[PDB]
């Protein structure tokens, strides 16, 4: 703690200067109370945690939204309504963890209609979590994504009040922002309604 | 007030008039059948007339030996 | 946390024998009433070419009735069915008729209120 | 001061401080070298400063 | 019952209660499979509902008081009760007096060539179905 | 729900940023706006403890302190992650040994040992480099003594030495709620008290987190304010029947009216305990 | 007269313009017919079809050469291509024949309906065979249904619904072998 | 967990033991009490894998009766105390040997 | 849960052949002939595959 | 082969090898593989890439090929 200590205490803004840092730490098996990840908690302003069962649903960047934790989600410092947003998002990815036992045995058709309002709100906005990085265009191919502040507050603000509840959940997995899941769920719609007759080949009798 | 057979005339139904001549039917079998047919005599449910919304009453109801003869 | 697990374990080991009790009573509860659906079918077929089948019909007074289950751990039924009860209740009303709305079943009731409130009697 | 990211899961549920420690954690290959990848490429080229 | 070993008691026991406890070994396995199943009392099938209560009128006849060890001759004939029917109308609450019922009531020399033969023999046998007939089972 | 009394120790157990140091700020800022409408001998003077956070987090509550005016109360006692080992495990001591001037002199004291976790961290470190055998989780055998010889120094004083009080809040910090760990154990057997906050409350909106469940009070309503006291078993027992209809409260379609009365009965009382950080009521 | 073309295909494409297309077009009781009323056939010389039906069970689903229904104007008999009827039904005896041996089904009472394509339709509530009447408790009940004398009007409709029952109850069950 | 629901003192009856429960010792009329509060409360926690995610709908009235029989004893359990008079308003409660078996 | 012959045509000879197998992988064992009587037999790898 | 690879899962993406059941396509890109022309495999593997004159003369050569069942 001391080692670490008296090396993260030297990673800071002062008066003269401003260090902003960014610093990747490894969990040894997926463990958070392993010491090293545990003791490294302590010394950071924002912290990004990144977890293996968000990734293997395939949303990227796989930030775990009820571990990831910063001192600016703060009314005062970021504004009422970026705040309200934020918890009101957590407060239904929250209520949706709450339910994954009872979905996991009993299913989906057990539910309250109450419950299963925020089933499906929480699955919107877990899939609109995530976004195509520009890094990752060379492995992925989908282009990436600089989401301005203003659209994914008013893009999650969007979620939480019901505008897009008749949208179907796919549309909001790797967009931008709020415009990009309707005109990915007009592409998803028409995607199932086009359809051509003998498909325009004109492959045979090419000349020369 | 009414014009129709004697149980219309009288205030019943012909499903009660019906499943009276079926009650006193199956009174009139024999034990090996008459048990058998007990079986769908009973009549076990409750309704509650709701006005409001989700407010209501509640009759609940109860038989085993059939239909009620009586005027409800 | 060692023994969170070993308490979790116990309890999921006895949903997976309660379940699978609650499924056997269910089939053998099932065996038993197909023998009385196919004695109460007969019945139905005579009315049926004595009066047809008329569901879109000019009337102006109605009573739709939505059958479902008491219990309510059958999976999909008696919403499924609530979602074809709106289906009829938008299909019926071009003209400004009456609907009396009634439900059998607990699940029925727990459901119908939720999209029809006024016409539920 | 908040610190504009790009990232929707990052500018919105935990914004980053400009001049705070931010960190990144996660382990084997859920990709917390792609995210650095990304803030790299998304703050410090609308930075002005220098990077180490 | 269903953790408790002896490895060595396949053949390794009192032959007379041989005869009956390899049947009891198998009535409470079954029972024990559809114990946790058949918590609820509502809704059974004819068959496994029996298995649910021949397996409580064993589990009640196996279960004795502290301090008073039972000679083998007299809880073989307890069991035999049990394994048998005799015992399958007294409901589960009189199975404790119902045994010391077949104890008091039969006759006592039954005892004596049981335990000198070590076995149910046919003859025995006879005489262990008639004599466990005229019991008064407090199931009344 | 968790009344404190003047000379207890009030244990704010919870994982990582769950709102401990939060309500011991609130402690602490609330001080301020009691000292002014009480008399000298009602006075609380508070003590903060930091062992083994940042400089920039003992920076940002001293700019706070002194934004509300709780620094002319307050003693700041910092031994911040760069310290040595030995001044982050003395500080807890040398904070209340300051602490314990009001107690002593027949004022009131209140002093928070942020992070107790990280004392005895840097407690364990100065005892395996002393080659003093490791026991549990490393731990020296004496962190118990460690933890009682410092707990046991917030009392309230007799009238024939003062009457003054110290008033100890530490704050242990678990690991995925794990209180079963070898220094929440230990703290948990020391002091009066526990305000245990947890992480899935505080994402259900419910802010301050505090487990109503496992939060208890051994001075209890012994020392509460009355007329807080008359209202608060009404508001003890509607959650504790608020707390076992749920885990039925999935099947809002099956109404009783009778458990839904206190399934919303519940649920007022718990939107009432909700409240926004840095304003004391 | 005939301004309002409904149908369960006519359902159908009204149905897909106001409800949700995720879900198919709910069922009808018609679709499960095999049998409808106006259409030409199913008479086959002497041999019509018959159902009897009571609503928990089914007594008889043949073809037969003639039935003999009890109507509350009296006994008639069906043939082949009888003339189109609904007759409703007293409590009494169903005879349904097709050669040397008979059927006799004592009916409580409930309709029976001849339809324009040769088929019958026996649609009544409790069908006592004649085999498995009490003719004990025919005249116990008879006593206290003859002497029950209520003022309210609806135990007489009842009692006369009373009587009337095992009067031909009796009669059924003396001159038979 | 006793005390979760509130009953103090929180006194688990099934986990209590004592070398006095002996019926040689206490005479059966107390032992038989005794052993029967045990089976009625072990009972009711095996029966709580189903009323605690069903809802007591499904037993028949035949083990409905050994809950409301159970939960009842839970509560007669609970004591009020002459040293908590001070933690909660109200009075302390001693009781005799012969009152607690008669009452149980 | 369902019955004998609850399930397909198809499916009554795959517990025919199924239960016909199971008798067929039983052996009598000739060190156990002396408490059991019948002779054992070894069975050669070219008859059990043949034979299956 | 690497063009024998990126044949056959040309053959499988582009529908040529769809109606074909399930428990026979290990037996029916064995047929792909070895009834269609060696050339496209040594003009593939030597361009490296499917070039429109060949993704025109491979789904000709693909239509020739006798799938089992059909
Ligand atoms: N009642 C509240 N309402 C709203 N936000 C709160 C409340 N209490 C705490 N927070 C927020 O929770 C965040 C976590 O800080 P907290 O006060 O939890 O410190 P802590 O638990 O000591 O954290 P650490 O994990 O650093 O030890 C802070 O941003 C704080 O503003
Ligand atoms: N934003 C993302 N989009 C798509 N894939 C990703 C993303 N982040 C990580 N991955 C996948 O995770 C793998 C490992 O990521 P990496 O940054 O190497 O993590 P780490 O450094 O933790 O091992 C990458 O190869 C990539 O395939
Ligand atoms: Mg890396
Ligand atoms: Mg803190």
Same mark, same amino acid.
């Given at each position: 703690?001391?080692?670490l ?20 730490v ?6 958070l ?11 950071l ?7 293996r069962?968000i ?12 571990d990831?934790?910063?001192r ?7 504004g009422?309504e970026?705040?309200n947003?934020a ?8 209520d ?9 045995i ?12 925020t ?18 265009? $060379?492995?992925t191919?989908t ?5 301005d ?7 999650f ?6 505008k ?13 922002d709020?415009?990009?899941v ?12 086009s ?6 080949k ?7 | 007030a009414?014009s129709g057979?004697?149980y ?8 009660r ?11 009139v ?5 008459? #048990?058998? #047919?007990?079986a ?5 449910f409750?309704?509650?007339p ?7 009453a ?10 009620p003869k009586?005027?409800? | ?7 979790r374990?116990?309890?999921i080991?006895?949903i997976?024998?309660?379940?699978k ?11 038993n009433?197909?023998?009385? $659906? ?10 049926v ?6 569901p879109?019909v000019?009337?102006?007074?109605s009573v739709?009735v939505?059958?479902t ?13 609530t ?11 071009s ?10 079943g607990?699940?029925?009731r ?7 409130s006024q016409?539920?009697? | 001061?908040i610190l504009?990211?790009g ?9 980053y401080?400009?001049?705070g420690?931010?960190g ?21 080229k609308a930075?002005?400063?220098?990077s180490? | 019952?269903g ?7 396949s ?14 070994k ?5 029972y024990?499979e ?8 509502s809704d ?14 064993l ?10 060890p039972?000679?083998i ?7 035999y ?16 007096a119902a045994?010391?019922?077949v ?8 005892? !004596? ?5 070590g !076995?149910?023999?046919?003859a025995?046998?006879a005489?262990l179905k ?6 008064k089972?407090?199931?009344? | ?7 207890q120790?009030?244990?704010?157990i919870?994982?990582?940023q769950?709102?401990?140091?939060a ?8 001080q !301020? ?26 920076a940002?509550?001293?700019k706070?302190?002194t ?11 910092? #031994? ?10 003395l500080?807890?001591?040398?904070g ?12 009131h ?5 942020d992070?107790?976790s990280k004392?005895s961290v840097?407690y364990?470190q ?12 490393a731990?020296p ?9 410092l ?5 309230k004083?007799?009238?024939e030495?003062?009457?003054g ?6 704050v242990?910090?678990?690991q995925?709620?794990?209180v079963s760990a070898?220094?929440?154990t230990?703290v948990?057997?020391i ?7 947890e992480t899935?409350?505080?994402?259900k ?8 469940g ?8 012994a020392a ?9 078993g009404t508001?003890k ?7 076992? $209809?749920?885990?039925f409260?999935?099947?809002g379609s ?9 399934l919303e009965?519940?649920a007022?009382?718990?939107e009432?305990?909700?409240?926004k950080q840095?304003?004391?009521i | 007269?005939a ?5 369960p295909?006519e ?18 009781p018609s679709?499960?017919?095999a049998? !409808? ?6 008479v ?13 069970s089914?007594?008889?689903?043949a073809?037969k050469?003639?039935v ?18 609904i007759?409703?039904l007293k409590?009494?005896?169903v005879?349904?024949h097709?050669?040397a041996?008979?059927?006799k089904?004592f009916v ?5 309906? $001849? ?6 339709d026996?649609?009544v509530?409790?069908?006592?065979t ?8 025919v005249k ?23 009587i ?5 109850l ?8």
């Amino acid at each position: 703690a001391t080692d670490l200590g008296g090396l993260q205490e030297r990673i800071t803004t002062t008066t003269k200067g401003s260090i902003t840092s960014v610093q990747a730490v490894y969990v040894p098996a997926d463990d958070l109370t392993d010491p090293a990840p545990a003791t490294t908690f302590a010394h950071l302003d924002a912290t990004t945690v990144l977890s293996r069962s968000i990734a293997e649903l395939g949303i990227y960047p796989a930030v775990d939204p009820l571990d990831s934790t910063s001192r600016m989600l703060n009314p005062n410092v970021i504004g009422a309504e970026h705040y309200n947003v934020a918890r009101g998002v957590q407060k239904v990815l929250q209520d949706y963890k709450n339910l994954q036992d009872i979905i996991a045995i009993l299913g989906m058709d057990e539910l309250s209609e109450e419950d299963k309002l925020t089933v499906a709100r929480a699955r919107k906005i877990q899939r609109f979590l995530s976004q195509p990085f520009q890094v990752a265009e $060379v492995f992925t191919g989908t282009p990436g994504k600089y989401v301005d502040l203003a659209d994914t507050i008013s893009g999650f603000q969007g979620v939480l009040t019901g505008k897009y509840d008749d949208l179907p959940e796919m549309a909001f997995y790797m967009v931008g922002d709020i415009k990009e899941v309707k005109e990915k769920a007009d592409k998803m719609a028409k995607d199932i309604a086009s359809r051509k007759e003998a498909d325009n080949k004109k492959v045979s009798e090419e000349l020369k | 007030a009414p014009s129709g057979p004697f149980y219309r005339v009288a205030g019943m139904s012909y499903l009660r008039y019906s499943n009276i001549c079926a009650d006193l039917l199956r009174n009139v079998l024999k034990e090996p059948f008459k #048990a058998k #047919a007990q079986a769908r005599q009973a009549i076990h449910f409750r309704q509650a007339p709701y006005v409001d919304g989700k407010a209501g009453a509640s009759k609940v109801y109860e038989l085993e030996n059939g239909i009620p003869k009586t005027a409800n | 946390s060692n023994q969170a697990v070993k308490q979790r374990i116990r309890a999921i080991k006895n949903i997976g024998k309660i379940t699978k009790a609650m499924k056997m009573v269910a089939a053998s509860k099932m065996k038993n009433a197909q023998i009385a $659906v196919e004695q109460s079918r007969g019945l139905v077929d005579p009315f049926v070419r004595l009066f047809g089948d008329f569901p879109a019909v000019n009337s102006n007074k109605s009573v739709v009735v939505a059958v479902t289950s008491d219990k309510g751990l059958c999976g999909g039924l008696n919403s499924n069915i609530t979602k074809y009860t709106r289906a009829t209740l938008a299909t019926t009303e071009s003209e400004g008729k009456d609907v009396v709305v009634v439900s059998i079943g607990d699940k029925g009731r727990s459901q119908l209120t939720r999209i029809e409130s006024q016409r539920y009697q | 001061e908040i610190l504009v990211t790009g990232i929707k899961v990052v500018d919105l549920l935990a914004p980053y401080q400009r001049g705070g420690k931010i960190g990144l954690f996660g382990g084997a290959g859920v990709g917390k070298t792609v995210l650095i990848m990304e803030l790299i490429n998304n703050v410090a080229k609308a930075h002005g400063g220098f990077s180490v | 019952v269903g953790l408790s070993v002896s490895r060595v008691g396949s053949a390794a026991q009192f032959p007379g209660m041989k005869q009956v406890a390899g049947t009891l070994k198998l009535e409470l396995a079954q029972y024990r499979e559809v114990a946790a199943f058949a918590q609820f009392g509502s809704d059974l099938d004819a068959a496994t509902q029996y298995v649910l209560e021949r397996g409580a009128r064993l589990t009640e006849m196996l279960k004795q008081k502290q301090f008073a060890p039972i000679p083998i001759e007299r809880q073989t004939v307890a069991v035999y009760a049990a394994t048998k029917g005799f015992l399958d109308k007294v409901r589960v609450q009189d199975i404790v007096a119902a045994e010391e019922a077949v104890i008091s009531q039969v006759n006592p020399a039954v005892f !004596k060539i049981l335990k000198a033969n070590g !076995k149910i023999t046919p003859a025995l046998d006879a005489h262990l179905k008639a004599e466990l007939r005229k019991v008064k089972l407090p199931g009344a | 729900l968790v009344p404190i009394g003047r000379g207890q120790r009030e244990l704010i157990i919870g994982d990582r940023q769950t709102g401990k140091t939060a309500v011991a700020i609130d402690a602490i800022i609330h001080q !301020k706006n009691c000292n002014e409408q009480v008399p000298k001998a009602q006075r609380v003077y508070c003590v903060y403890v930091a062992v083994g956070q940042k400089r920039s987090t003992v920076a940002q509550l001293v700019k706070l302190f002194t934004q509300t005016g709780a620094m002319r109360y307050t003693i700041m006692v910092s #031994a911040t992650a760069s310290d040595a080992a030995p001044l982050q495990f003395l500080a807890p001591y040398s904070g209340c040994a300051m602490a314990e001037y009001f107690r002593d002199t027949g004022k009131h004291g209140l002093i928070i040992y942020d992070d107790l976790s990280k004392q005895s961290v840097a407690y364990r470190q100065m005892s395996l480099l002393l080659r003093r055998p490791p026991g549990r989780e490393a731990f020296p055998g004496d962190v118990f003594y460690l933890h009682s010889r410092l707990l046991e120094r917030a009392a309230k004083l007799s009238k024939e030495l003062g009457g003054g009080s110290l008033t100890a809040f530490p704050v242990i910090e678990t690991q995925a709620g794990d209180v079963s760990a070898y220094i929440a154990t230990n703290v948990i057997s020391i002091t009066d008290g526990q305000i245990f906050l947890e992480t899935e409350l505080f994402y259900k909106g419910i802010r301050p987190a505090l487990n109503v469940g496992l939060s208890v009070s051994r001075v209890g309503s012994a020392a509460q304010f009355p007329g807080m006291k008359q209202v608060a078993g009404t508001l003890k027992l509607e959650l504790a029947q608020y707390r076992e $209809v749920a885990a039925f409260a999935q099947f809002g379609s099956d109404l009783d009216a009778a458990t839904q009365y206190v399934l919303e009965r519940g649920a007022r009382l718990t939107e009432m305990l909700k409240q926004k950080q840095f304003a004391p009521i | 007269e005939a301004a309002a073309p409904a149908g369960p295909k006519e359902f159908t494409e009204v149905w897909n313009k106001k409800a949700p297309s995720t879900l198919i077009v709910p069922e009808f009781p018609s679709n499960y017919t095999a049998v !409808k009323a106006v259409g030409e056939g199913q008479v086959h010389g002497d041999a019509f079809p018959v159902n009897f039906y009571t609503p928990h069970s089914i007594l008889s689903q043949a073809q037969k050469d003639t039935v003999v229904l009890p109507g509350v104007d009296g006994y008639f008999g069906v043939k082949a291509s009888h003339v189109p009827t609904i007759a409703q039904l007293k409590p009494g005896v169903v005879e349904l024949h097709s050669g040397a041996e008979s059927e006799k089904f004592f009916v409580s009472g409930g309709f029976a309906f $001849v339809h324009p394509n040769g088929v019958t339709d026996i649609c009544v509530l409790e069908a006592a065979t004649l085999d498995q009447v009490d003719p004990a408790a025919v005249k116990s009940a008879l006593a206290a249904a003859s002497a029950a004398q209520p003022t309210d009007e609806f135990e007489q409709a009842a009692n006369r619904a009373a009587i009337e029952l095992y009067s031909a109850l009796e009669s059924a069950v003396e001159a038979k072998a």
